UniProtKB/Swiss-Prot annotation:
Protein name (record): Protein Tat
Native source organism of the sequence: Human immunodeficiency virus type 1 group M subtype A (isolate MAL)
Motif annotated as Cell attachment site, chain positions: 78-80
Subunit and partners: Interacts with host CCNT1. Associates with the P-TEFb complex composed at least of Tat, P-TEFb (CDK9 and CCNT1), TAR RNA, RNA Pol II. Recruits the HATs CREBBP, TAF1/TFIID, EP300, PCAF and GCN5L2. Interacts with host KAT5/Tip60; this interaction targets the latter to degradation. Interacts with the host deacetylase SIRT1. Interacts with host capping enzyme RNGTT; this interaction stimulates RNGTT. Binds to host KDR, and to the host integrins ITGAV/ITGB3 and ITGA5/ITGB1. Interacts with host KPNB1/importin beta-1 without previous binding to KPNA1/importin alpha-1. Interacts with EIF2AK2.
GO MF, any single term: trans-activation response element binding
Modified residues (N6-acetyllysine): K28, K50, K51
Length: 87
């Protein structure tokens, strides 16, 4: 997960708000994040038991709110952690 950039990746969320995205800690409320904190379903680098780093590239709205990529509210790359599938 960490060697891309990242713009909007298959799974790479650093933090949340205010529109940051990273902060000095993972997840971290201000500001929006509703309920789902970080349940580790996809063990690339940032989700990781003996891995885990953190990289920050756009402003951003979607990379402060989102877990997955498409506008499809369910689970397993669909609506992974907010009220928010795309944002």
């Amino acid at each position: 997960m960490d060697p891309v950039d990242p713009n909007l990746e298959p799974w790479n969320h650093p933090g949340s708000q205010p529109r940051t995205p990273c902060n000095k800690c993972y997840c971290k409320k201000c500001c929006y994040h509703c309920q789902m904190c970080f349940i580790t379903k996809g063990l690339g680098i940032s989700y990781g038991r003996k891995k885990r780093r953190q990289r920050r590239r756009p402003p951003q709205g979607n990379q402060a709110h989102q877990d997955p990529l498409p506008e499809q509210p369910s689970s397993q790359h669909r609506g992974d952690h907010p009220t928010g599938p795309k944002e």
